[PDB]
Structures are given as C-alpha cells and as structure tokens.
Amino acid sequence: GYVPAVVIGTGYGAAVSALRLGEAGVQTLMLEMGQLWNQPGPDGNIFCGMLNPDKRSSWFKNRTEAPLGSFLWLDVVNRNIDPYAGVLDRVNYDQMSVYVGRGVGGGSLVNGGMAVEPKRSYFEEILPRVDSSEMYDRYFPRANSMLRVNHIDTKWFEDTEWYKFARVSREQAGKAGLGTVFVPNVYDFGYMQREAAGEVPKSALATEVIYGNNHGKQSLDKTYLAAALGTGKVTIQTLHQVKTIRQTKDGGYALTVEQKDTDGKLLATKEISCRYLFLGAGSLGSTELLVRARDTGTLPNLNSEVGAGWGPNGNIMTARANHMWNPTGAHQSSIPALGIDAWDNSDSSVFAEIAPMPAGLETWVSLYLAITKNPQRGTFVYDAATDRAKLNWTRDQNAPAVNAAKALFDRINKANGTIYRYDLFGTQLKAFADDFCYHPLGGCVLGKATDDYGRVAGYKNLYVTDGSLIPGSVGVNPFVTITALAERNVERIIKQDV
Numbered sequence: 001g002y003v004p005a006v007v008i009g010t011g012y013g014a015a016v017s018a019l020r021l022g023e024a025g026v027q028t029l030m031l032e033m034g035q036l037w038n039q040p041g042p043d044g045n046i047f048c049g050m051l052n053p054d055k056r057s058s059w060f061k062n063r064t065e066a067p068l069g070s071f072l073w074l075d076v077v078n079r080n081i082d083p084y085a086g087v088l089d090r091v092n093y094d095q096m097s098v099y100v101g102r103g104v105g106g107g108s109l110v111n112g113g114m115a116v117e118p119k120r121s122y123f124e125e126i127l128p129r130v131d132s133s134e135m136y137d138r139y140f141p142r143a144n145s146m147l148r149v150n151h152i153d154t155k156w157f158e159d160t161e162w163y164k165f166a167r168v169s170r171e172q173a174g175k176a177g178l179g180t181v182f183v184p185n186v187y188d189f190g191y192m193q194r195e196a197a198g199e200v201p202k203s204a205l206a207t208e209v210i211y212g213n214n215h216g217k218q219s220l221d222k223t224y225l226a227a228a229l230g231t232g233k234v235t236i237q238t239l240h241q242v243k244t245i246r247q248t249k250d251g252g253y254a255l256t257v258e259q260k261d262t263d264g265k266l267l268a269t270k271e272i273s274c275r276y277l278f279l280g281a282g283s284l285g286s287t288e289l290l291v292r293a294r295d296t297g298t299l300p301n302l303n304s305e306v307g308a309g310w311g312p313n314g315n316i317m318t319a320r321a322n323h324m325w326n327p328t329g330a331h332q333s334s335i336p337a338l339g340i341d342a343w344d345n346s347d348s349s350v351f352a353e354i355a356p357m358p359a360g361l362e363t364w365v366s367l368y369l370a371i372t373k374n375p376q377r378g379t380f381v382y383d384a385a386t387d388r389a390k391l392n393w394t395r396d397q398n399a400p401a402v403n404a405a406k407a408l409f410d411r412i413n414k415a416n417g418t419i420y421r422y423d424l425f426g427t428q429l430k431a432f433a434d435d436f437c438y439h440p441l442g443g444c445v446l447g448k449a450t451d452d453y454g455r456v457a458g459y460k461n462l463y464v465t466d467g468s469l470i471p472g473s474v475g476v477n478p479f480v481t482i483t484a485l486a487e488r489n490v491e492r493i494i495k496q497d498v
C-alpha cells in the first residue's frame with residue numbers, strides 16, 4: 001500500500017532519517033531485508049558468539065567462517081549450517097569481499113562500536129562543497145549524543161587483563177615514535193567493567209561482536225530506531241527486501257518488495273508506494289537499487305555518476321608476531337579501545353585499530369585494521385543477466401593501501417626487531433589482507449550522483465542517506481560521519497522539501 005515516506009534499510013542513514021521524519025509528523029515505513037534480532041535462540045541468546053558460530057552468524061551461507069585474522073585458531077569451531085537470515089553477510093565480488101550487517105540496525109549490529117569523528121581538515125578535503133562549520137558545530141555533536149558514544153575509563157583500561165593486547169601494541173608503537181589514541185565507542189564501558197568483575201552477563205568479554213552482542217553494545221535498535229518508533233509515526237517491516245523502484249505516473253515512487261521467511265522462502269511480493277523515498281540500504285544496497293533502476297529503465301533519468309566512486313575506506317588487515325616476553329593475553333575484549341593515529345592527510349596516512357583476537361589462548365599475535373588514503377576507486381556496474389550490481393574493483397587497486405600500511409608497520413617492526421605474521425589469511429604467504437572491506441564507502445557520491453544533501457540527481461523527493469554518499473574514504477571508522485551527514489541532510493530535506 002501507500003505510505004507518505006518509505007525508508008529502505010535500517011542502518012545509520014536510514015535510522016537518522018526515520019527518526020527526524022517521524023518527529024516532523026511524517027508517517028514513515030522502514031523496509032528491512034533482515035530480521036528484528038530479539039528472539040532467544042537455541043542457546044538462550046539472541047546472537048551467537050565467535051567461538052560458537054551457528055546459522056545466526058551468516059546471511060545465507062552453508063558453512064560458518066572464522067573472523068578475519070583468526071582462521072588458524074577458530075576454524076576448529078566452524079560447522080556446516082543451513083542457509084538462514086543470519087546477521088553478517090560476506091558479499092563476494094570478483095576481487096573484493098564486503099562485509100555488511102543484515103537486520104534491524106544494519107551494520108550497527110555487527111560492528112566494533114568505534115565512534116570516531118574524522119579530522120576536520122580531511123573532511124574539508126573530501127567534501128569541499130559541504131559547510132564544515134555546521135558539521136563540526138552542530139551535526140557531529142548531535143550524532144555523538146544520539147548514538148550514546150562513551151569513553152573508556154583510563155585507570156580500568158590500564159589495569160585490566162582484557163586490554164593487555166592494546167597496551168602491548170601501544171608500547172611497541174611508542175618505540176617507533178608512534179602514539180596511540182583512545183577510541184570512543186557505543187558499547188557501554190561501565191557495563192564492560194562490570195562484566196570483568198563478574199557482575200553482569202558477559203558479551204564483549206565473552207568473545208562476542210561480529211555476530212552481534214547479546215549485551216552492552218548500543219546498536220541502532222536501542223538508540224535512533226527505538227526513538228523513531230517512539231514518535232508514533234514510524235513502523236518497521238522485516239524480511240522485506242526492496243527489489244525495484246519506479247516513479248509512478250501520478251507522482252511519487254512505487255516499490256516491488258519481496259517478503260521472505262528466515263529460510264529465504266518467498267512468501268509474497270508486494271507493491272508499496274510513497275511520496276518521499278529515502279534509500280538507506282548501504283553503500284552496496286542503495287547503489288545496487290539505483291544502478292538497477294537506471295539500467296532497467298525504471299529511473300531512466302539517473303546520471304552516470306550512479307555506481308561510481310566506491311572505495312573500501314583504505315581497509316587493510318595485518319599482524320605482527322610479538323616477542324615471547326610480550327604476550328598479548330588469552331583474554332581480549334572484543335571491543336577495540338586503542339588505535340595508532342599516523343594520519344596527517346598525506347598519502348602515507350594510516351589510522352590503525354589495535355584489534356583484539358578471539359582465540360582465547362596465547363598466540364603472541366598483534367592484529368591491526370589499517371585505514372589508509374588510497375585514491376583508487378571502483379564502480380558498480382549492472383549485470384542485467386543476473387540482475388546484480390557487480391563491483392569493478394581489482395586487487396591491484398589496493399596496492400597503495402598495502403604500501404601505506406606496510407610502511408607504517410615496517411617502522412614498528414624495525415624499532416622492535418619483530419616480523420609480520422604471514423599465515424593468518426591463507427596458506428600462501430600474505431602479511432596484508434587486501435581484498436576485504438568492513439567500511440564500504442561510495443557508489444552514490446554526495447554532490448555527484450546527488451546534490452549536496454543526498455537528493456538524487458534527476459528526481460524530486462528521492463534521497464540517498466547512507467555510506468553510498470561518502471567518496472570512498474573518511475580516514476577513520478565511518479559510522480559517526482554517516483550519522484552526522486544524515487542528520488544534516490534530513491534536517492535540510494524536511495525544511496525545504498517536506
């Protein structure tokens with residue numbers, strides 16, 4: 001049926017948009033292809049942990065997979081599973097695997113919670129048409145408050161066994177003249193301290209994050225989406241995937257929407273129409289919908305920039321072997337708290353998470369997720385034969401990202417007399433994982449596929465809200481930027497258009 005506003009997806013861009021629409025009195029329907037994650041499963045928990053993955057871990061796969069970096073220790077717990085509407089989707093393209101969340105809350109369900117504002121000078125470089133003063137004065141603060149960002153207690157961090165891994169990398173980086181920074185988070189650090197004291201059920205301290213956190217993590221279902229539902233003007237329909245978008249002959253937009261069960265069986269195909277249409281299906285999902293609509297003729301006035309300008313936020317994973325005297329600990333919180341900030345906006349820039357590992361026994365490995373500045377971009381092209389967007393990215397396009405990560409970690413290895421691990425990402429010698437992405441950015445870039453507020457070029461009352469807007473790189477973990485930009489955009493849209 002008809003609803004004034006439809007929001008596709010329930011990640012960061014979608015959740016912000018729906019809250020503000022509802023507060024403005026606009027009846028809004030959110031369509032989410034994944035589940036509402038609120039049913040206790042066979043272990044009594046909503047989500048599986050990293051040491052007990054089951055079908056809940058995976059979006060329609062037939063075998064569980066180890067978290068990247070941990071195959072050597074966690075393959076032993078992998079099992080065959082029924083294809084199911086699980087929470088983490090590894091989306092495989094030709095030469096890149098992009099990991100995304102599936103469910104009410106999108107990537108907020110599966111992410112590490114790291115809530116980081118980009119460097120203002122870098123923001124100004126990547127988005128020169130946007131007023132940076134409003135962003136830093138108004139929208140970034142609004143996002144940090146709404147997201148429930150909080151900060152780890154430094155004394156607890158210094159003392160706890162659960163962050164030994166972070167302190168070891170801090171010390172090693174320091175010998176190379178590199179400093180660390182604390183990373184704010186949406187995981188409640190007060191709750192985490194109580195986990196360590198045995199006072200509340202563990203989640204971060206029980207090897208949970210990438211398949212969801214049963215406690216502690218303030219994902220969007222608890223923050224923006226709860227508030228959106230609280231307006232009385234927003235509803236969310238789950239296991240509903242939008243397939244096609246057209247402009248109706250009488251104005252507005254019409255969607256074909258498939259309803260499935262959790263086994264992926266098609267239950268119904270529905271037509272849903274609206275006056276205002278907001279895409280929050282992610283870098284992958286929003287871009288796919290729009291390239292499909294352009295190339296199948298249902299939104300024929302979309303421009304050539306739709307599909308373009310994708311990058312993986314310079315994501316590279318690597319690992320160092322510590323000296324025997326620098327164990328990283330068997331007990332590592334699943335939520336990172338420290339990063340190495342070597343980002344100066346130059347091509348050598350690196351901002352690297354000090355990543356925990358879930359093995360639960362001593363391995364001496366330090367793991368890092370580097371964010372780099374690599375100008376290479378890919379393009380989503382529509383394949384009409386299979387009705388899918390394909391991402392034209394090649395592995396060699398990550399060479400500059402590998403080079404920057406390697407130059408930084410080579411400094412740390414030189415200062416400490418350590419070497420890389422070469423065995424964490426497959427049997428072939430490979431110290432740098434260069435074909436994954438947790439932070440997909442672009443495909444519907446702000447100001448190129450859209451105007452400076454995400455209004456899709458060629459169309460009225462059609463908006464993109466999410467990571468597809470960002471031009472490939474933000475230099476930090478991206479969700480705070482997506483959230484703040486979405487706050488800016490929807491406020492202007494409600495004022496001028498609605």
Ligand SMILES: Cc1cc2nc3c(=O)[nH]c(=O)nc-3n(C[C@H](O)[C@H](O)[C@H](O)COP(=O)(O)OP(=O)(O)OC[C@H]3O[C@@H](n4cnc5c(N)ncnc54)[C@H](O)[C@@H]3O)c2cc1C
Nearest residue numbers: 009011012013033106107112114242285466467477478479
């Ligand atoms: C393992 C992992 C760790 C991460 N750690 C961090 C971190 O610590 N900090 C950080 O800043 N970022 C982190 N990220 C990245 C962050 O989660 C994403 O940048 C963010 O979630 C993107 O928000 P979005 O609104 O663009 O889309 P998403 O959050 O991806 O949400 C899109 C939603 O739309 C739904 N959807 C897609 N297509 C359709 C359709 N056709 N119809 C209906 N629904 C649809 C999806 O199922 C999903 O729920 C991490 C990501 C991963 C994979």
